[model samples]
Target: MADLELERAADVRWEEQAEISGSSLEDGAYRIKQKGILGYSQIGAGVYKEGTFHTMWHVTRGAVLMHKGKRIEPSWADVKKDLISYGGGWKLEGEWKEGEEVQVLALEPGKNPRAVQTKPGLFKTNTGTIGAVSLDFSPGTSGSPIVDKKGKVVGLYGIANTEK
Candidate 1:
């Protein structure tokens, strides 16, 4: 077996239904325990409806599968955890407010990974160099959920980066 190489990008897209076209949390990749839906929007641009915008991410790592005519987004929670632990530190940042439209994905999979595991959240960005790492996320990551390898629900992504 070969070790999987992680790829980084910024053009990932999540699936959505025609009905419930608001920030009410629709069932999609993240909901299906497979992949995660990153980004947000108010107006849509699909043929089924117009006026609802959808947020999209780069789908940097993982695989995208499909089932029952619906698309599945790939997740990288396990990979994210590996990176953070391998480096010995993480820099997560986000705010969890009641009745807010914020969403984030987890960097590790499993219930309460943040409280259970000792990995970092979404903060440190690996630029493949020492002393020159980039900050992936910093502050204000609420509605984010980190996914695992088996496509199971892992944990939330956004928390807070206190490296300042």
Candidate 2:
């Protein structure tokens, strides 16, 4: 089934790519279950929403299918955890702008986790663009969740570098 899905993805329209849209959380790929940490080779984007923390599947190192994303508490956030309710509609496309500033909590090698808010410019999509928005993501920010000033999980700063 998974193999068929991969092959079919070759022609999926950008609008149909809920996976690339960062909505793959529905696959139960990111249920909260942390036995330990660090299959953690290269950190990918991690986003916290509805009281649960989420990251890229590859970043978790197959911990994804097994369901082992780390569960964090509100205290884990350096600040407050608040955002507009799911409301309605997908908060993509016109929802954000290119060169618009955003923020993320980055954890570089030797350094501790700190907030590095900057511009991501225009984001790229398979067919269109996402505008994550196009910032030069730092080396160790693979697991950082991309955020806008309004406190929205605009995108997960995962491995933007991929074979597209």
Candidate 3:
């Protein structure tokens, strides 16, 4: 049933296939919005957090998070201009190593921005064969949360390719 529902899940909002087994994949996933129209129709996730909004530093640089009609600006975000420069994005409190199961909430290129999208795969760190996609880099999925199977956010998504 899960496979059937997620068959055509792309370009669609959080619908039937959102919950697979017990994981609520769309839990903290939200849309990304910049000063203009996302440069229009692009989508990504920010792993919505209270003050800092645990997302890609680059996204918060000039973009704002759009959630439920509220605009969250990264006005007082991290002042260091080095996280992105380091190539790797933000990581959760717990350690996320390679070969571990992980999921990313990001609408693919040329998809609807109405709600969240899905990408499930093993994590790859430090320049490897990653298999996810996100905003901010045009596909609008850079700042997305790299969530583990337990629904625990493990990292802020940065680089990935949706090639299965």
Candidate 4:
């Protein structure tokens, strides 16, 4: 009984520490905005390279890309072609291990702009794997980028509540 109690104590401590650790982003994290009839929303964060910014597909759906108030649109044909690609053009850059520390940048009204680093729990699916972070992300954070301490993007932030 004592041994079991000690193990339980250690598990509790680890979970507490994991909950406290948060994520951060470097300079110039990609900020993808989604505009609808409702208004503008911060959808996701990505890294822009060359001339293309890679982000989750949901961030780009039914929304026009904007930069500095200028609207940008991709060719419909190209968008269709890309959608046919594996994982719908969503690619994971690095191996995501359970309990790995990751960060995501989010813009919320009345909140300071910064990245929150947190440990990502594992979420397995039939299609692909997703990192489940304890952060309470709003719907706007659907496409946010998940990066590691070394500044490597590992995955895209998707669903918020996994429990159904």
Candidate 5:
């Protein structure tokens, strides 16, 4: 994939949504997860909402496994009520401006995880979403955390298509 500036792309539109919830591991990080299997799972960071985690219906549509081989019974109601706050895992900050330098936590196959820095090209308050950066994130990088210079999470990464 090519690293293209999102602001320069006219044919693209934000089409995907990711769940943003508080990190179970630490307070400084967030937990990001998405639904659908374009194949493979991509994990990232996010913040909690009213003591609950938010995600798409498909994510909890079936059984999910955790790090220690623990099984999660799909139950959105249970999750929303904090009843399922077991083994799980953003620092959501204030307003993020356009062109602000941000880093994305990228995870690649057979490679150590790394952070990719780029600028926010745009933001849409109508849908409450942020635009993509100028880097080509790996397949599993979606749902990753997008943090600012001070390590505060400003947004979460989502899937985008390359223009032909």
Candidate 6:
């Protein structure tokens, strides 16, 4: 079974997969808000075994894979393609059409064998991997509105920053 609780964070208003046309992580910050959420579809598999299992044992620095509606591993290059199909034109705030299948993205605790830090501003991880994605919201936006590409209210927006 997968950890669904991460999807229900108080700060997370909504979430959906989308193609990453661009992304940049520098100075301990990652941002990718260029592609607006729009018409997109994501279809994949989810892994679930019949039995009682300890989630903590399976989870390290992060989850091995997304085992809910769709089973996905961050190590797969095809994940980006799947993200595009599921959330290619994703927006900050959007709505899901009736019968639309979607999933949430969150960060967990796990060790990546491929991740390597070359310098301060540059880190060579996977050539084509989704890795992990996070977000930050403006102050007073906590528990506010988080929409998708369709402009539908999805989740709340929050803020996370550090004073220099």
Best by lDDT: 4
Q: Candidate 3 lDDT, tens digit per residue, 1-164? A: 00000011232123434433322222245454433433433333455333334544554444544444454444434545212211123434533443444555444445543323344345556645555433343445555455554555555555433232
**TM-score to true structure, per model:** 0.22, 0.43, 0.46, 0.53, 0.45, 0.17
lDDT of each: 0.24, 0.35, 0.41, 0.44, 0.37, 0.23
lDDT of 6 at 88: 21
lDDT of 4 at 79: 44
Model 3: residues >4 Å from true position, as ranges?
A: 1-27, 35-44, 50-52, 62-91, 97-99, 109-138, 159-164
Give the winner by TM-score.
4
Task: Point out the higher-scoring one by TM-score: 1 or 3.
Answer: 3
lDDT for 46 (candidate 4): 46
lDDT per residue (tens digit) for residues 1-164 in model 2: 11100000011011111212111132111212233344323333344344344444444433322222532222222112121111122232224444455555444433444455565545467756544333354544454545455545555554222111
The list of candidate 2 runs beyond 4 A from truth reads 1-45, 64-95, 123-126, 132-140, 159-164
Report how far residue 115 has shifted in candidate 4, in Å. Answer: 2.4
Locate the minimum summed-lDDT window of 10 residues in model 6.
25-34
- Candidate 2 residue 47 Cα shift, in angstroms, is 2.9
Residue 70 miss distance in model 5 (angstroms): 3.7
For residues 1-164, write the lDDT of model 6, one tens digit per residue. Answer: 32332121122223333323223100110111111146211111111112111112112122333323653333222322222111122222233332222222222122111111111111234332112213332221122232334433332222111111
Model 4 residue 112 distance off true place after TM-score fit, in angstroms: 3.1
lDDT of 5 at 152: 48
Q: What's model 5's overall lDDT?
A: 0.37
**Cα RMSDs, all models:** 16.4, 14.9, 11.2, 14.7, 13.7, 18.4
Evaluate residue 141 in candidate 4 and report its C-alpha lDDT on the 0 to 100 scale.
51
Query: By TM-score, how accurate is candidate 6?
Result: 0.17
